Design a protein around this ligand. Structure first.
Ligand SMILES: Cc1cc2nc3c(=O)[nH]c(=O)nc-3n(C[C@H](O)[C@H](O)[C@H](O)COP(=O)(O)OP(=O)(O)OC[C@H]3O[C@@H](n4cnc5c(N)ncnc54)[C@H](O)[C@@H]3O)c2cc1C
Ligand SMILES: Cc1cc2nc3c(=O)[nH]c(=O)nc-3n(C[C@H](O)[C@H](O)[C@H](O)COP(=O)(O)OP(=O)(O)OC[C@H]3O[C@@H](n4cnc5c(N)ncnc54)[C@H](O)[C@@H]3O)c2cc1C
Ligand SMILES: Cc1cc(O)c(C)c(O)c1C=O
Ligand SMILES: Cc1cc(O)c(C)c(O)c1C=O
Ligand SMILES: Cc1cc(O)c(C)c(O)c1C=O
Ligand SMILES: [Cl-]
Ligand SMILES: [Cl-]
Lengths: 428, 427
């Protein structure tokens, strides 16, 4: 027969993983708890877009048909600005090259992706409650909350930051089963490009900028074809977060209080927002990172494995690499065990998930820490004191090192290492 | 605002190129002169490199290939053997590794490939007669023998060794427009694995070996699940090819060219059906393409660099071309969204220019190298037993040449390809 893979979670990574798997002949089901919803925006590095292409070129097509339509060709730049002093001097700039980042709306991209898939791959209102493992040779059983069941040769948790599949591995009372608070949260909202331009200038208004300063920072970029500018404003919170929901209503005047000393251009951007906005809490896996991404015939991927604070803007890139590593590994399982017994085929699954863990965990968990580390540098208290300016500006070399370690990932090597580890684990 | 490519030729390359373009959102039409399939029951094999190239074009291509053909994982070895002397001693061997090669039935692979494509991509009974190019900003018009026409932003010739798009580029009276004789031809036929063993041993009969000797060489490997072995015997021809490039031949005609060769090999020939086939071997060596593309017209596969088959990898070189041309046209598609008609058509030609720069050297090296290694398989020196020392150093050259085919850095080809396209654009 073929090999069946139950993917729990119909987010970006689950659906991309699925698309890569069916394009290779693997039987896939995606179980998503929500009711065909996408209830925001995200960005991919050029490296991740090449990973997408290797999964299935239609994915990249979906990405670019969802987004927008932009004489020479523009290079993509991360830029940092002093947010605290009126100097508002441009501190640093990182060149990511042509189409170094490519952008979509999360909900439009997912919709396009599912159109690309065969029919009846995605099952909605399928909330996983329990996993029943048995022998390596038996199918794994998924139990859902509406009383239904599925049977699959192996299981992938693409079920996000609050992964149920993760709870199964470490235990519901283990801190390793849950995310925890980064003691930061963000205000988000939009403003008119005209308003934006009014406060920052046409040049700042039309590019992405991080404004640094003490214990907080703010980022903004143009959206909806340079008519609107999106604002995300991040602040510190010495208090624990109450089951209070991670997202919640807030007001512009609350956000303005945190930036009261900051420079006037920046305080304006804030004042031009709707009176009512969101407050998103930033949880992640930093405090209690997974001891393993895989056990037996169960593998975590994306935010289920390594959910990160969003301050490299690449968290979903790490998950796309995961998807590619898991797709290529399971393809090698399919082809190398094709004529063999049920025992070899199930051993090979476990051997592949063992290779996955071996090759992906260090980089994924490095990235989770890195995402906190760079937030710290964007929020150094010494951005306040102009006599500590050399110290504070010295951070950018490390930011650059970390950025390039993300963007320049050698995924061909990862795949090679993974195939080699798979074959080793099989006794070969 | 979509980009239409007319592929002339529904062969393996034209169809794989199509599969790559459509998966990336490009409007493709494939124009095939034949009514259905040909090359029934033939096999072919692809290097692992070429299979990774296919996966990059569309992973579904690789699925197709694999549905068209305990203990450990097997390794793939090329083997040479002395075919002249009584000793028939193993001469050299080369490790290609796990899945170093993957094989299939051509017609079943092509047919599986067509199921992967959407409907209506391929139009049969469409034999390109003439190409009409107006201005770079206007569409290229294709005229077919049935009197219908077709209009496309650009044209890819994937129409094979006798490419009609090639004749258009260089002139139907140029010799550069036609392949020519390599002064070798081939006898093909099957025998039963039963008989194959009795003449060679179980060892030789159940794998691929090339038997070398003076002015001729033989290769055999198994088929129909190791129930039959397939023979190809290549011999030298001083004369010109008059006449039709395929023809019937007799077992005895082939045995004549292998009179002095050792008895195991002679026996193999002996065991063929009375009637078999003779195939002339043409290629683009004598008059190689001055360029693979001009304006909005580009050649790929055999249309551009048809080679004699003694490296066994000519489709692989072609799949490389399809990968480069797919990645290039996709870069045109995205780099030019919202630009004008003018710019988009300069983008196409700029991309075809980069195709030419990046591929033409490797591809024409491969044509040469194919004749070259054939010459090493057929050194007159194999018979002379005082030159069996110089003769046998050929194999360091076979190895380097094989590795240059097998370890192609195709990611660097794509990189160089994009950078040369940007350069051509003014970027
Ligand atoms: C504000 C913000 C901005 C970001 N910007 C970027 C950016 O610019 N670039 C970038 O690369 N990344 C970015 N990220 C990261 C990105 O959002 C995530 O890393 C990415 O969504 C992770 O993929 P996922 O599909 O695993 O997660 P999710 O999208 O959260 O997918 C989880 C899915 O599983 C489902 N699910 C959960 N529990 C169950 C269950 N029990 N049963 C069934 N289904 C279940 C959920 O309903 C959901 O559909 C950003 C993140 C945030 C928060
Ligand atoms: C005996 C032999 C064995 C080989 N074994 C291998 C092997 O194991 N591995 C490997 O990689 N390579 C192998 N090769 C090389 C391989 O067969 C060729 O390189 C390959 O088939 C080229 O494919 P193509 O699509 O470019 O051309 P072709 O396969 O020749 O197809 C061209 C297509 O265009 C069509 N066409 C022609 N003129 C027109 C026109 N005017 N209008 C419309 N359509 C037209 C033809 O009908 C045909 O269908 C072998 C070659 C030979 C001779
Ligand atoms: C690319 C990107 C997108 C984004 O949404 C955020 C918050 C970022 O910090 C970055 C890069 O640093
Ligand atoms: C090992 C491997 C397998 C594979 O299928 C693809 C896509 C690769 O590029 C690599 C690279 O090492
Ligand atoms: C399938 C196949 C094709 C081929 O061309 C060679 C040289 C091989 O050794 C194998 C398998 O071993
Ligand atoms: Cl992120
Ligand atoms: Cl060939």
């Amino acid at each position: 027969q073929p090999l069946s893979v139950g993917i729990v979670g119909g987010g970006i990574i689950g659906v991309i993983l699925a698309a890569g798997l069916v394009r290779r002949g693997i039987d896939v089901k995606v179980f998503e708890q929500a009711r065909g919803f996408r209830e925001a925006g995200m960005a991919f590095t050029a490296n991740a877009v090449r990973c997408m292409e290797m999964l299935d070129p239609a994915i990249v097509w979906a990405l670019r048909s969802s987004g927008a339509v932009p004489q020479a060709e523009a290079r993509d730049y991360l830029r940092w600005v002093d947010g605290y002093h009126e100097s508002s001097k441009r501190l640093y700039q990182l060149d990511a090259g042509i189409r170094g980042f490519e952008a979509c709306r999360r909900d439009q991209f997912l919709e396009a992706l599912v159109k690309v898939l065969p029919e009846g791959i995605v099952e909605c209102q399928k909330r996983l409650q329990k996993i029943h493992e048995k022998n390596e040779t038996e199918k794994v059983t998924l139990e859902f909350a509406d009383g239904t069941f599925a049977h699959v040769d192996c299981v992938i948790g693409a079920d996000g930051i609050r992964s149920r599949v993760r709870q199964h591995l470490f235990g519901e009372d283990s801190p390793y089963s849950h995310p925890h608070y980064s003691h930061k949260f963000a205000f988000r909202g939009l403003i008119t490009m005209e308003n934006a331009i009014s406060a920052l200038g046409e040049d700042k208004a039309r590019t992405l900028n991080m404004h640094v300063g003490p214990n907080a920072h703010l980022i903004h970029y143009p959206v909806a074809n340079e008519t609107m500018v999106n604002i995300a404003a991040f602040v510190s919170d010495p208090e624990e977060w109450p089951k209070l929901s991670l997202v919640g209503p807030a007001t512009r005047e609350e956000a303005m209080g945190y930036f009261a000393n900051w420079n006037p251009g920046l305080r304006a951007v804030l004042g031009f927002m709707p009176e009512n906005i969101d407050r998103w809490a930033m949880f992640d896996t930093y405090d209690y990172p997974a001891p393993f991404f895989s056990r037996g015939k169960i593998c975590l991927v994306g935010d289920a494995a390594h959910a990160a604070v969003p301050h490299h803007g690449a968290g979903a890139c790490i998950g796309i690499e995961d998807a590619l590593c898991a797709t290529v590994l399971l393809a090698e399982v399919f082809v190398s065990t094709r004529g063999k017994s049920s025992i070899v085929r199930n051993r090979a699954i476990a051997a592949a998930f063992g290779s996955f863990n071996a090759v992906r965990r260090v980089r994924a968990q490095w990235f989770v820490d890195s995402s906190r580390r760079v937030c710290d540098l964007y929020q150094q208290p010494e951005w306040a004191d102009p006599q500590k300016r050399i110290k504070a500006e010295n951070c950018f070399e490390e930011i650059k090192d970390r950025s390039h370690k993300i963007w320049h990932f050698d995924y061909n090597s990862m795949l090679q290492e993974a195939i080699e580890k798979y074959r080793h684990n099989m006794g070969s």
